[PDB]
Amino acid sequence: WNRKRISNCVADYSVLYNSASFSTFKCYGVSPTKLNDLCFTNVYADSFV
Amino acid sequence: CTFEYVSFKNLREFVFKNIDGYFKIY
């Protein structure tokens, strides 16, 4: 499994929050609409098949 | 790494402060 870190930007999560054309996309832990109106220390990604 | 910001006639004065964890250079 690969670990990626994201830092030093403004996190416009609306790009992936407004895809709506993805098979199974679940956001657990935050309200996605208010995610673009809230702030975070780090952004990480983990992917597994 | 956390961040990577890679961007006697002459006299240079520098002031270094790190307060509240914020690092300031003057």
Which amino acid belongs to residue A14?
Answer: S
What's CA B22's distance to the chain center, in Å?
11
Which of chain B's residues have a Cβ under 8 Å away from the Cβ of A8? Answer: 3
Which of chain B's residues have a Cβ under 8 Å away from the Cβ of A7? Answer: 2-3
Residues sharing a CB contact under 8 Å with residue B25, sequence separation 6 or more, in sequence order: B14, B15, B16
Number of A/B CB contacts below 8 angstroms equals: 3
Number of H helices, E strands in chain A: 2, 2
**Is B7 within 8 Å of chain A by CB?**
no
Q: φ, ψ for residue A24 (rounded to 5)?
A: -140, 100
Q: Which of A17, A16, A49, A9 is nearest to A34 (CA)?
A: A17
Nearest CA in chain B to A41: B2
Contact present, A4 and A44 (Cβ < 8 Å): yes
Contact present, A5 and A48 (Cβ < 8 Å): no
Resolution (Å units): 3.5
State both tokens at A7.
Answer: 């830092």
